[PDB]
Hints:
This is part of a larger assembly, with chains A, B, C and D.
Chain A: E1 2-8, E2 12-20, H1 27-53
Antiparallel strand pairs in A: 1-2
Chain B: E1 2-6, H1 12-24, E2 27-29, E3 39-41, E4 61-62, H2 69-72, H3 74-83, E5 97-98, H4 106-119, E6 125-126, H5 133-141, E7 149-151, E8 166-174, E9 180-183, E10 187-190, H6 203-206, E11 224-225, H7 227-238, H8 242-265, E12 273-274, E13 276-284, E14 290-296, H9 306-318, E15 329-332
Parallel strand pairs in B: 1-2, 1-3, 3-4, 4-12
Antiparallel strand pairs in B: 5-7, 6-7, 8-9, 8-10, 8-13, 9-15, 10-11, 13-14
Helix pairs in contact in B: 1-9
Chain C: E1 2-7, H1 8-25, E2 49-51, E3 57-59, E4 61-65, H2 69-76, E5 88-90, H3 99-124, E6 130-136, H4 141-156, E7 161-168, H5 179-193, E8 196-201, H6 202-212, H7 220-239, H8 248-255, E9 263-269, H9 284-291, E10 308-316, H10 321-334, E11 347-352, E12 362-369, H11 373-387, H12 394-397, H13 403-425
Parallel strand pairs in C: 1-4, 1-6, 4-5, 6-7, 7-8, 8-9, 10-11
Antiparallel strand pairs in C: 2-3, 9-12, 10-12
The site of guanosine-5'-triphosphate (GTP) has 29 residues of chain D, from helix 1, helix 4 and helix 7.
Protein name (chain A): Stathmin-4
Function (chain A): Exhibits microtubule-destabilizing activity.
Family (chain A): Belongs to the stathmin family.
Amino acid sequence: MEVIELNKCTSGQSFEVILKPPSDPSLEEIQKKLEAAEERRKYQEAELLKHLAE
Amino acid sequence: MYTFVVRDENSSVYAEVSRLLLATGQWKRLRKDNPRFNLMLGERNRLPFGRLGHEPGLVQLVNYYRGADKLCRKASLVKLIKTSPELSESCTWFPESYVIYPTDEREVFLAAYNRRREGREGNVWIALISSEASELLDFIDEQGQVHVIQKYLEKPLLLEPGHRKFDIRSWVLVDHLYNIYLYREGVLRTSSEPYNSANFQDKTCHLTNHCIQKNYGRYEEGNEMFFEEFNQYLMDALNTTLENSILLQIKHIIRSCLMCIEPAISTKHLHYQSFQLFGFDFMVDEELKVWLIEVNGAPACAQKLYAELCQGIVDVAISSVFPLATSIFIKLHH
Amino acid sequence: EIVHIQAGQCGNQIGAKFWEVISDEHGIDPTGSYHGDSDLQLERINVYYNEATGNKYVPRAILVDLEPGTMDSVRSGPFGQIFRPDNFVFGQSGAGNNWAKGHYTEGAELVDSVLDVVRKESESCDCLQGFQLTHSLGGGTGSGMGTLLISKIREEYPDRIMNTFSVMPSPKVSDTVVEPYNATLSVHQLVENTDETYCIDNEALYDICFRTLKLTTPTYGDLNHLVSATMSGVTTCLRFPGQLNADLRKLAVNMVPFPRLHFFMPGFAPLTSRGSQQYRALTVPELTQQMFDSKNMMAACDPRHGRYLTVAAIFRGRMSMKEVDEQMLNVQNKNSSYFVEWIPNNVKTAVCDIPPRGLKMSATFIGNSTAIQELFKRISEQFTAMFRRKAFLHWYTGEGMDEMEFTEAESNMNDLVSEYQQYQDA
Amino acid sequence: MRECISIHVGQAGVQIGNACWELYCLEHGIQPDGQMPSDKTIGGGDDSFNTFFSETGAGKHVPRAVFVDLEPTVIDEVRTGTYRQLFHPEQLITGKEDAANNYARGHYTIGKEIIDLVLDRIRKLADQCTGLQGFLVFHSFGGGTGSGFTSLLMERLSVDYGKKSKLEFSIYPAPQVSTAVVEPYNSILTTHTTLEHSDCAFMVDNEAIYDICRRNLDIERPTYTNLNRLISQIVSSITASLRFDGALNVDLTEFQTNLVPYPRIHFPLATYAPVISAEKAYHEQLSVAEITNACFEPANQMVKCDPRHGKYMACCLLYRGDVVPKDVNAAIATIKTKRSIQFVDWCPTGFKVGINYQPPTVVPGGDLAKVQRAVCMLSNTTAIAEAWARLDHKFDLMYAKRAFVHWYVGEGMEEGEFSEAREDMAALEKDYEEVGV
Ligand SMILES: Nc1nc2c(ncn2[C@@H]2O[C@H](COP(=O)(O)OP(=O)(O)OP(=O)(O)O)[C@@H](O)[C@H]2O)c(=O)[nH]1
Ligand SMILES: Nc1ncnc2c1ncn2[C@@H]1O[C@H](COP(=O)(O)OP(=O)(O)CP(=O)(O)O)[C@@H](O)[C@H]1O
Ligand SMILES: COc1cc(-c2nccc3[nH]c(-c4cccc5[nH]ccc45)nc23)cc(OC)c1OC
Ligand SMILES: Nc1nc2c(ncn2[C@@H]2O[C@H](COP(=O)(O)OP(=O)(O)O)[C@@H](O)[C@H]2O)c(=O)[nH]1
Ligand SMILES: [Ca+2]
Ligand SMILES: [Mg+2]
Ligand SMILES: [Mg+2]
């Protein structure tokens, strides 16, 4: 019912209408996470190449 | 071949619907957690409505209306009737009820209790029945579960011979289009012992439930008086009919209750579809005036009627959406 | 870019048929010159062909055998001149249907020469995505040396996709009694070293030729007609553009839920005998119903005895893409017990406008069904029948092998079977 | 004036970027070659559109955009396409081989070799900004690059540009146009890792868009091009207030204030009306009341869910075309009495309205017809948790059997990260549960 804070211009116009009232990780840790996964990949590729060597 | 799942084993009714569907040979039952179904005969608690209607090339239908618990829970039913403009507190067919919590409208409950104390006219209430307000409140406050306090009908209609209290149960099928189908057969769940006017605590004469009555079968078979029986009694004893004296008011209450919530629960433009079988429980007073006691979301049908009702559910709720290769319902018009 | 390898008699014969079929589809003649009529034919021709002097296309194909015989037949055969002459790598004394000769003695002499041609072709590749091998598992060269090549390719290219079209042996089409041995030793290798293996069962190819196609005595040429049409089918998404943006690695990711369970049942519709052209085109419901029928499966397994982990299907021709979606969804919803419920959206369907030579409508089926265990159980039974009496074992022990290696192969294939059974009841 | 950089990750992000910048160019009157004849301050200025376009001395208006894909094919169509001149090569970054529908390959393996290149090219746009307010990130939940590389980018943008805001346009996966079976895994993994780094996220369920294109545009089998041109209308409506003169949603910080009170629950539901077919023979033009009313039908939502069963925390109405406040307030008053709109007790039951008089622009030869007036409602409702429940159940079915997990572990990722991510989603579903009961 109550329309408030009405603003206008040439492009358009805006307002609010109220019906009723109420009642991060660092650069170090990211590089550590990526490289720990790269080491787990390298370990797994080593286990493959060790198995193929046998 | 249409597909269905069953996720409520305790369902007396939909056990017979699943049995009847298989027997036609155009339906096969799938595993509980198979998402690739046409029909769902779902669970009572935490039914995952958010998973329905998201399977490509599968029209999905479920036997419950999401949000229908507002009508089928006691605390909510009272809140629906008080707050809704369609029904209002003016509403003449619902007992004067109040919501009370264990340690809320205790201030409003006591105001009408002390207005009953002005003239000092009959002042009985029900939660378990007692007359004193402080005796009732102390039962509720050390229980834990919330149940409402309701105006007890002191002057109910009494069947003769017997002087027996009773309640009427009517079965209502709301389909996917929101047609409201009332089943032509209801049932009177009767007391088998005389209604005591003075003392309230006597169990079997005041409460008239399916199971608590297990006198069990004195005046009729298993405390169940059907609609042909009860019509004839009214014609002989009272000069009126079931249709005129009681059944119009039932039809008015059912219709008024489901019209109220239609915008909240309707599945008209939705991605999945709902039907549901409801159990409306009524209470007739000595002046032939019908009152709504409770609405039941998972209703237990009476033994004689299973074959007929569960076929009707298949006819107009299931086969209307999923067609195959006189009616038992009275349609309430809106 | 894919590097193709074909090893042994069977490998080179189905492999030669493959290049025959897909060259016709891309409009490439027996001299390697493009004489087609569509830009859609040339848009992904890099995947299988290298571009040469005078805008000629040459298959990225390495031809391997320990016998000179079969590769002389390839060279003198209809499309033999398109293959790059340096890619013909061959020994002289054969493998005599002996896995040990292929894997450990005769094939060892020759393997490094093949890897030099592989490396030459791999360095030309802008972005090598993987390798595909054609071979049988029942002889010596394709089976023994083919799996040695696979093992050495995984050493040098450990992060690339290895793909096989592995022809399985059957008494109905049997060169020698030692085939179950050669097959079991090879299955052990494929379980460890390949990302995808198309199980092409010669039993299935015979039964399709006898029962469905009405050929009372089918030759290898009749069998290979079914193999080539299937091979064209499964490689359609790599060879032609589509909405899916298809890739060897992505196929492996989406088809293989567990690393050891990468053995697919190929299937094809409509089934056709050689030469004679059928006149009535199939409806989309007929294609869909046929490709899922056991009679059209190239691996002799009844899919109703197992469950589908994943499915890939590829429709070829001018048809309603809506009608395909409807029918594919119909098969799933009407037979939902035969697809696993614990992998959602496990059937994917692609469409290609260009149909194969002969047909106007066709469908190729690729299923990772648990019913493939029947194939392995069959070869395991034939293995045990001989191995319990150490029969014919001297051919292998004479080439340096021990009985232990046979016991380990038997044991890993029985593990594969019980692991397939694990998910059939899960 | 405050600049905004648009980042497009993966095929979905890139091809949706294409659709958007094409539309932005039509709306502002910028050409394929980047010349804008209506602009008078040549080689500079701080107008509302300069939020999305910088300028060169030659008069070209270049998108403040970086397109990043781990595979060349898709971004190559931008390089050779009709808007080739619009971007300069350094904005269009391509890797060698894709993430193959694998979060872990996109995040860990192939992500690591390209993250520094991208942040550098992002810095080269940020150094042209006199007052950068933040980033609009476009991607798919389903793709390996869209899920994996995006979450790595969002991690590092919080480190490098900690004071600036980050908004998401995310494509939620649907079987009707799926490219991979493991999209549920990728969706949960990326949502977990991106959650604290994203200030507001507009999810678009491809299911919802697909059916809108079938039902309302009469297209039997919708292509990506069909889906994207519709998505770009919704995007344009949402971004319009950053690119045009107005007083609602003028900076990215205002999207957080208006739509996002609870910071984890930052997924507003977009609803859009009306969608009308370009070769509909006879069309009756729909009024303010009818299109505002259409914002409460689930069939027009970007995610299919039921707002009636759930609670609202905020509600924006963004109108474009012939709309006046008087009609809007009369439309809202009617709808309030007929529909189930329930706000949380701690929020006001109300609507922030924004009208722009320029009616919605359509791509010539497109599937969308010209309309006199349209609307995009942005409502933060708890009913969108239905989308989380669906997606989490699909994750549970597969993860219970460890299906496909080895592909992820084989790229360096630990099995623990799956259930760690799933616990966060289980907490997210609980956060929604508490708010709307
Ligand atoms: N709406 C829309 N969705 C798309 C588009 N392209 C792909 N998708 C969806 O995005 C998901 C797949 O992600 P993509 O963005 O294609 O993959 P990617 O990010 O390039 O990652 P990889 O190719 O795995 O490295 C699927 O759910 C597709 O339906 C598009 O142009 N529009
Ligand atoms: N206000 C009231 N006046 C008269 N009787 C009442 C009453 N409220 C409850 N009762 C009696 O109590 C009995 C059971 O109460 P109620 O129906 O609330 O619980 P129930 O929910 O356990 C039975 P059902 O679920 O099958 O309807 C009824 O048979 C009715 O006669
Ligand atoms: C390599 O060629 C193919 C790639 C694919 C393919 N390419 C990229 C992603 C894919 N995802 C799947 C896929 C395979 C199986 C179930 C699936 N569910 C969702 C996707 C999906 N197949 C893909 C599919 C094919 O068959 C139609 C191919 O022909 C064999
Ligand atoms: N389908 C098919 N199978 C073949 C062909 N040639 C041989 N085989 C099968 O392959 C096995 C023999 O292997 P072969 O390739 O001849 O031996 P290799 O050359 O030493 O590898 C037997 O089981 C044969 O049935 C062929 O042209 N087509
Ligand atoms: Ca300017
Ligand atoms: Mg031979
Ligand atoms: Mg990609």
